[PDB]
Design a protein around this motif. Structure first.
Motif, PDB file in Angstrom:
ATOM      1  N   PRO B 129      48.433  -7.079 118.913  1.00 40.99           N
ATOM      2  CA  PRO B 129      48.495  -7.772 117.774  1.00 40.99           C
ATOM      3  C   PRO B 129      49.787  -7.883 117.204  1.00 40.99           C
ATOM      4  O   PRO B 129      50.447  -6.694 116.986  1.00 40.99           O
ATOM      5  CB  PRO B 129      47.184  -7.315 116.905  1.00 40.99           C
ATOM      6  N   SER B 131      51.980  -8.122 113.682  1.00 41.28           N
ATOM      7  CA  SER B 131      51.556  -7.520 112.451  1.00 41.28           C
ATOM      8  C   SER B 131      50.889  -8.404 111.434  1.00 41.28           C
ATOM      9  O   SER B 131      50.291  -8.199 110.749  1.00 41.28           O
ATOM     10  CB  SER B 131      52.949  -6.865 111.783  1.00 41.28           C
ATOM     11  N   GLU B 133      49.340 -11.086 112.184  1.00 40.19           N
ATOM     12  CA  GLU B 133      47.793 -11.513 112.291  1.00 40.19           C
ATOM     13  C   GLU B 133      46.906 -10.365 111.863  1.00 40.19           C
ATOM     14  O   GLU B 133      45.712 -10.815 111.467  1.00 40.19           O
ATOM     15  CB  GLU B 133      47.595 -11.825 113.773  1.00 40.19           C
ATOM     16  N   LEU B 134      47.442  -9.024 111.968  1.00 37.18           N
ATOM     17  CA  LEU B 134      46.676  -8.010 111.398  1.00 37.18           C
ATOM     18  C   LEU B 134      46.327  -8.208 109.900  1.00 37.18           C
ATOM     19  O   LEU B 134      45.073  -7.942 109.526  1.00 37.18           O
ATOM     20  CB  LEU B 134      47.232  -6.691 111.986  1.00 37.18           C
ATOM     21  N   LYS B 135      47.333  -8.641 109.351  1.00 39.12           N
ATOM     22  CA  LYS B 135      47.375  -8.674 108.041  1.00 39.12           C
ATOM     23  C   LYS B 135      46.270  -9.725 107.591  1.00 39.12           C
ATOM     24  O   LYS B 135      46.251  -9.926 106.406  1.00 39.12           O
ATOM     25  CB  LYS B 135      48.808  -9.391 107.544  1.00 39.12           C
ATOM     26  N   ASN B 137      43.219  -9.537 108.934  1.00 40.16           N
ATOM     27  CA  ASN B 137      41.631  -8.908 109.489  1.00 40.16           C
ATOM     28  C   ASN B 137      41.498  -9.513 110.899  1.00 40.16           C
ATOM     29  O   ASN B 137      40.288  -9.469 111.455  1.00 40.16           O
ATOM     30  CB  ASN B 137      40.550  -9.749 108.850  1.00 40.16           C
ATOM     31  N   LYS B 138      42.293 -10.082 111.626  1.00 39.49           N
ATOM     32  CA  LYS B 138      42.047 -10.479 113.126  1.00 39.49           C
ATOM     33  C   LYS B 138      43.322  -9.917 114.086  1.00 39.49           C
ATOM     34  O   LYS B 138      44.275  -9.471 113.569  1.00 39.49           O
ATOM     35  CB  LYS B 138      42.148 -11.942 113.265  1.00 39.49           C
ATOM     36  N   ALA B 139      42.877  -9.574 115.387  1.00 40.18           N
ATOM     37  CA  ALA B 139      43.619  -9.119 116.286  1.00 40.18           C
ATOM     38  C   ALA B 139      43.531  -9.729 117.739  1.00 40.18           C
ATOM     39  O   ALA B 139      42.129  -9.823 118.251  1.00 40.18           O
ATOM     40  CB  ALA B 139      43.649  -7.651 116.552  1.00 40.18           C
ATOM     41  N   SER B 190      40.601  -6.806 113.003  1.00 38.65           N
ATOM     42  CA  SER B 190      41.870  -5.863 113.114  1.00 38.65           C
ATOM     43  C   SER B 190      41.362  -4.402 113.086  1.00 38.65           C
ATOM     44  O   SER B 190      42.346  -3.538 113.619  1.00 38.65           O
ATOM     45  CB  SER B 190      42.740  -6.208 111.815  1.00 38.65           C
ATOM     46  N   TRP B 193      40.809  -2.885 116.715  1.00 36.55           N
ATOM     47  CA  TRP B 193      42.039  -2.663 117.262  1.00 36.55           C
ATOM     48  C   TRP B 193      42.594  -1.193 117.207  1.00 36.55           C
ATOM     49  O   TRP B 193      42.832  -0.433 118.173  1.00 36.55           O
ATOM     50  CB  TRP B 193      43.248  -3.782 116.665  1.00 36.55           C
ATOM     51  N   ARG B 194      42.842  -1.029 115.919  1.00 41.36           N
ATOM     52  CA  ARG B 194      43.531   0.239 115.546  1.00 41.36           C
ATOM     53  C   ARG B 194      42.375   1.446 115.459  1.00 41.36           C
ATOM     54  O   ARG B 194      42.863   2.623 115.094  1.00 41.36           O
ATOM     55  CB  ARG B 194      44.196   0.244 114.054  1.00 41.36           C
ATOM     56  N   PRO B 216      46.608   1.375 120.511  1.00 41.26           N
ATOM     57  CA  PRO B 216      47.036   1.152 119.152  1.00 41.26           C
ATOM     58  C   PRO B 216      47.704   2.701 118.691  1.00 41.26           C
ATOM     59  O   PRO B 216      47.111   3.629 118.370  1.00 41.26           O
ATOM     60  CB  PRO B 216      45.586   1.140 118.669  1.00 41.26           C
TER      61      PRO B 216
END
Lengths: 210, 217, 18
Positions: B129, B131, B133-135, B137-139, B190, B193-194, B216
């Motif tokens: 993802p 950075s 898009e993560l900001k 809530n999605k990935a 998101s 993902w991590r 991740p």
């Protein structure tokens, strides 16, 4: 070098109207009959309208007669297709075509996409994608098609590959990529240029290390 | 009713001679028709005119491997030494004027596949993802599958080695050079993902399986 | 051959507007 370039395709609501244009060059425009042929999502081809060289005679099939008007401006080497009372079944890729003395549709343009639907247009959310090095550019959630993606304003020619969109939740998502010698990778600037005509939105996104 | 009938698809081996058939409705068996060709994601182009006697006229730049012939109501497009670039949809068309009226009809088109081309296993390029898009809530994980031939591939994704289903979108394969390419997206919050050790994009192609994973971190 | 002749004439008409 005969060339036909159609323009004007766009999202239109059912019952609406839209005018398409076809710009021609590389031949003597005023000497030929010109036509419009459309291709629907099932890939079937349908002849739409034909006009004689001087514009005196026009021909249409029942499917559009009374609703569509083909016309031309010989002084401007331009062909037109005015459409009205559009229905969702009219959605299709519209192509302009020029006859030869021996056949009807000898040379075709690139086509312009007409989408007839109640859905409103949604611009895409463009995200950069970072790892010869291969960089990407995610073009997410737009409507309708199409979008165009170039790199460094077209400077990055080869190495560039835009993938076919996927359709989910009535929205399209696609990705594009460019491969470039690892030397310039981060040292130089790499940006994707995404245009979504339906929303008059254009976005240049810088590709940055993560 | 002026009607052109064509089979929807056909397959031929590289180098073989292929023959495509377009059949006129009986009352129009004497008609001259046109053949068109449409390569993947590209504009249709003119191939040739074909008369009831089998005489035909080819468009500018069409390879001489393409020829036409006829038999009663049938109109044939033959392709000698069929090549990979001949892979395309072939459509016939026919026009006629009834009084002062013009009608022009196209057949349904025949999708032609060229078998026996050199196999080429797929390459996988994966991206995690952004950075930005993560900001949000999605990935979305992107897997670009390229340089493969034939076009059939089955894509799957794995989260910490386990197969995932809900949330995947893979495109259909697409012509590029002699090869094919496609893309697949795995849609994640998101969080997931991590919070997973790994993600894996898996492609099955002609018995072989290729995988490339993302981590991740 | 009749339709083939209507075809030739129509293509000429589009050019010359007979």
């Amino acid at each position: 070098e005969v060339q036909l370039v159609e323009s004007g395709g766009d999202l239109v609501k059912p019952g609406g109207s839209l005018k398409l244009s076809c710009a021609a060059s590389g031949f003597t425009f005023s000497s030929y009959g010109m036509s419009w042929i459309r291709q629907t999502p099932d890939k079937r081809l349908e002849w739409v309208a034909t006009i004689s060289s001087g514009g005196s005679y026009t021909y249409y099939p029942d499917s559009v007669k009374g609703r569509f008007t083909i016309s031309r401006d010989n002084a401007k080497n331009t062909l037109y297709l005015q459409m009205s009372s559009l229905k969702s079944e009219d959605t299709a890729m519209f192509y302009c075509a020029r006859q030869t003395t021996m056949t009807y549709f000898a040379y075709w343009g690139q086509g312009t996409l007409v989408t007839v639907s109640a859905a409103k247009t949604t611009p895409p959310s463009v995200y950069p994608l970072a790892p010869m090095v291969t960089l990407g550019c995610l073009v997410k959630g737009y409507f309708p098609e199409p979008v165009t993606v170039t790199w460094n304003s077209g400077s990055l020619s080869s190495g560039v590959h835009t993938f076919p969109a996927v359709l989910q939740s009535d929205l399209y998502t696609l990705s594009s990529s460019v491969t470039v010698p690892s030397s310039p990778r981060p040292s130089e600037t790499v940006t994707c240029n995404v245009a979504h005509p339906a929303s008059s939105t254009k976005v240049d996104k810088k590709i940055e290390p993560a | 009713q002026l009607v052109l009938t064509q089979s929807s698809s056909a397959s031929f081996s590289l180098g073989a001679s292929a023959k495509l058939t377009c059949t006129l409705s009986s009352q129009h068996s004497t008609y001259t028709i046109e053949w068109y060709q449409q390569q993947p994601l590209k504009p249709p182009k003119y191939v040739m005119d074909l008369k009831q006697d089998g005489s035909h006229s080819t468009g500018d730049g069409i390879p001489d491997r393409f020829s036409g012939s006829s038999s009663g109501a049938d109109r044939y497009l033959s392709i000698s030494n069929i090549q990979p670039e001949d892979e395309a949809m072939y459509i016939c068309g026919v026009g006629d004027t009834i009084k002062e009226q013009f009608v022009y009809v196209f057949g349904g088109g025949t999708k032609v596949t060229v078998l026996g081309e050199p196999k080429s296993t797929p390459t996988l390029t994966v991206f995690p993802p952004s950075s930005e898009e993560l900001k949000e809530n999605k990935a979305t994980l992107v897997c670009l599958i390229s340089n493969f031939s034939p076009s059939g591939v089955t894509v799957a994704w794995k989260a910490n080695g386990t197969p995932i289903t809900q949330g995947v979108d893979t495109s259909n394969p697409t012509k590029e050079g002699n090869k094919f390419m496609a893309s697949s997206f795995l849609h994640l919050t998101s969080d997931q993902w991590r919070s997973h050790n790994s993600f894996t994009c898996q492609v099955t192609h002609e018995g072989d399986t290729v995988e490339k994973s993302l981590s991740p971190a | 051959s009749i339709q083939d002749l209507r075809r030739r004439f129509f293509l000429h008409h589009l050019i010359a507007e007979i």
